[PDB]
Ligand binder design. Structure first.
Ligand SMILES: [Cl-]
Ligand SMILES: [Cl-]
Ligand SMILES: [Cl-]
Ligand SMILES: [Cl-]
Lengths: 296, 314, 296, 314
């Protein structure tokens, strides 16, 4: 019912999406948008079958998995809940959407097990969030972050120094898993289904599978709202007012709660590290359809 | 329809409100700011909650007809008036749109947002710039009256004179804003402070405050009068900034656990908006360390978590 | 004896001073340098009889007077001792050379008395530091700081809010005195004698009068060394290595301990608010004569 | 002549040194860092002071022949070597010249100064860039030997291996410097860390350390050998930065009350320079809250104030 009021006519709605997508082209030239509604209707326009690495787009997914498997109380002994590297007053990374927090979050998953298993455990949730659609792995990107990710090594050693990891966790193992998860590949199409799972309270809308808890989803959407677009997060919360997560790949994972998930891809980044076209497209779509979280 | 799903049964809902109100009485911690024992506003046991739904249903429990000064609760109201009369583009040349950091100016040389004192002082200055002191006040008071559906609205001259004589923090901010050139042309800093102190001294009750909060919950239309008070744009902006900046240093925790637009004040008030459902005003003077009502905050957390009112609840 | 080794031949020394003064002209066009040795020898070149307001150059003088009359222990309950507005860990202005500290310092002087008397009490020390040479007052500058000094009013109200003043002190009275003292006028010639008093352990070298205590002078020279040139203080300490104080008037009060005091005037300021020519002249003079505090 | 005025009578001077050394034994507060009870360096009662005048007179009292690792005391020595071999202009493209703030990079994107770990790591990297690990070490060790007039100089492999295995703070700094591109061309970050950890593990005694400090007091000429070890420019820079950055967060207090170039270390050492008079090395392991020797600092304050050695004493 709520969905029906927000999008009465799907074909008409996709027509407007296409028009905005087109306008935004007035900005390689990779440009794609896919969406998946909470009742499983789909639309892609442009370059939506090209694989690309999740990179930071994975941060809310791993956080949601940690909450789903361990609960809020425990997770947030190790990572904070608000916008900010550095550490906060309690001596922990500010939130799960900044690198230091995402690294700590990564360390929390299946602490009793090895590298291969941790990865496979996360991957099983990601597969289900995507309704078993396209999910790959870029060894090129993985090896590149391993060899050149000095910023993350610096953060890792700092977290270790400040005692920010759970007992018995090897810092280097946690970094290795974090780099692996950043190297998972999706397309706009599969990514949109993941975002739709978050839009749909943690149930994958193309399979009906329960993937994440309501608590995990609520927490994740809250932190995406406030921390999901790096230095542009405040502007985005004000003008667009929806949970989103950006990445250096030029991806934007956007959630419209109880309506749809979307994944946009356009590699060229603005000064704040967010897709120039993706961001502009979100603003135009939300203004036109009154999807802002505080639209009446 | 949407309201019906969020609150299927009003009477049953008010029954839960009453019970939580009662449970929260067990909480006695916190310190009252600017305690004057003769004054009802300083009573640590003052405790009241009122609400007004977007379709005009009402419920009060406890001390809901005791007047108290809006103080910081006026910040989002004056902001909403400025946007409604001048538009986003113009207002936000003079004030920012985001949280500051647990005060200063931002990268563009302007106060971080309308919910911190420096931003609220600038926002005060923007209203009816071509007119005099009396008229600015009356123009704001007319919007406030209408937001409250013409229910109780007073003025505390004692509070006004007290802030004038001892509000050193705000004078420091005022001179700093002047030094950094943060005010519009033709504005006298001292006049803008004077107006800000006046607006902070406007009095409401839980009941009249709840209606102001309901006007925000209802897209800018006062639900007990049908009047179009604020533009939709004004309300949307206001609710966004209340969500992220409305509870001072507790704003992050509140956004995470409660997930609603709220504004706290040193009076121990909490103006809470549940969009498309209701406005609520809670009052309990004893403050926790971050300056927010110990009981009010606890009550909001319990009510919102029981009823799934968090903005991102499924 | 020590002076004799540092400057064996005064006439030869002044000849080099003149040559540097001249070189620096390759930079109104007000430009003057005066010096006064600790044994009372004098040299001026350029515009050394033009009065100008001490402004910030007064900050170390008022601080020295406070120490001389009240002692270190007491003064430094209210003001800190190191480079940094804001307040420090103990809730007090960082040092006497920043505005907030200079304002608090001003408040400490003759607390039991009125405006006129406070001023006259400070003025009696300043007169004696200058060996009774030129000392005036600019009402233009005083009224201008009163009407336009919003930064200082902001600081004043902040100090009052944070309870940084001694008991019973009216903040506005303290600001008024601080603005008055900033408006005291000297020439390069009279100013050089003040600086020579500091170079000579607190005895005015043209009169033999004991003006300030050894403790006051030592403290003052220490803080001038580290805090006396605003954001350029670290560079200056490293390359020049002498106690100096700059002001917005384009003045530089320079002390060469046990050798001489100097006052330079050149109104055009660099980006950090210090006289472009004055600063350059200090660097060249010190490199040539090996006057750096850590020169062997 | 200048020396004669500062210390008119050597024997009388050493007598006062001895008495202050004795008085300071009453101070037992402080905490020993990285306490290993088998190791002499961890003994809270380890207490020694040696000095060497610029004309080569010597005095030791207490535990002055116990080796200990230079740790941070090596920072100003490696810096002085870099300036002496490469010059100010070149070195200070890679490291700043001033105190940081009670860690990060400065406005120009470089470590704040050579006395903080990040600056000392970069300074390490600058030395003999065209050569290998063994040679860099030996080249620095040769200057250190000469600064110490060929007196005691050792190496603790236990300390070196310990920092390699558990120095997480320094690895974090190292990767950050690499990320921000703070090293010269051709330098491997890990090699520079390894060298820095090696130099920190070089051992001296109070006696040999005092001579190194005397070389700095004497314009770069080792006073017990007459050898020209460091350039005048190197020494002047080094003493300036020790004055302002040498005692971590206590540097301001120390500059104000003591007014001399000094460098503290986590070992409880204090290398103190009295220019044109003497070098001194004090050792007492228990540290105050800011990481400086509780007894050493107190002893320096008492000695300097009694003898008027403050740089701005008249
Ligand atoms: Cl790794
Ligand atoms: Cl006023
Ligand atoms: Cl005044
Ligand atoms: Cl290593």
């Amino acid at each position: 019912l709520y969905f029906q009021s927000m999008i009465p006519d799907f074909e008409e709605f996709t027509g407007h999406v296409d028009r905005i997508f087109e306008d935004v082209k007035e900005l390689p030239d990779l440009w794609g948008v896919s969406l998946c509604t909470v009742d499983g209707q789909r639309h892609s326009v442009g370059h939506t079958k090209i694989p690309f690495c999740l990179q930071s787009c994975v941060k809310p997914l791993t956080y949601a998995i940690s909450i789903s498997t361990l609960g809020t109380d425990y997770v947030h002994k190790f990572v904070g809940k608000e916008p900010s590297l550095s550490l906060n007053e309690e001596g922990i990374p500010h939130n799960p959407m900044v690198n230091a927090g995402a690294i700590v979050v990564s360390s929390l998953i299946k602490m009793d097990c090895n590298k291969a298993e941790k990865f496979d455990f996360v991957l099983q949730y990601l597969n289900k969030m995507a309704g078993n659609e396209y999910m790959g792995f870029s060894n090129a990107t993985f090896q590149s972050e391993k060899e050149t990710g000095d910023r993350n090594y610096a953060i890792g050693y700092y977290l270790k120094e400040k005692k920010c990891f759970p007992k018995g966790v090897d810092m280097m193992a946690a970094l290795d898993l974090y780099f692996q998860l950043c190297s998972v590949e999706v397309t706009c199409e599969s990514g949109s289904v993941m975002a739709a799972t978050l839009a749909n309270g943690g149930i994958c809308p193309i399979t009906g599978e329960s993937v994440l808890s309501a608590e995990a989803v609520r927490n994740t959407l809250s932190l995406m709202h406030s921390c999901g677009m790096y230095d542009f997060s405040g502007q985005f919360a004000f003008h667009v007012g929806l949970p989103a997560k950006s990445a250096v790949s030029g991806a934007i994972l956007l959630v419209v709660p109880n309506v749809m998930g979307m994944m946009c891809l356009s590699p060229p980044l603005d000064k704040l590290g967010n897709s120039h076209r993706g961001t502009s497209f979100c603003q135009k779509l939300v203004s036109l359809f009154n999807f802002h979280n505080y639209d009446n």
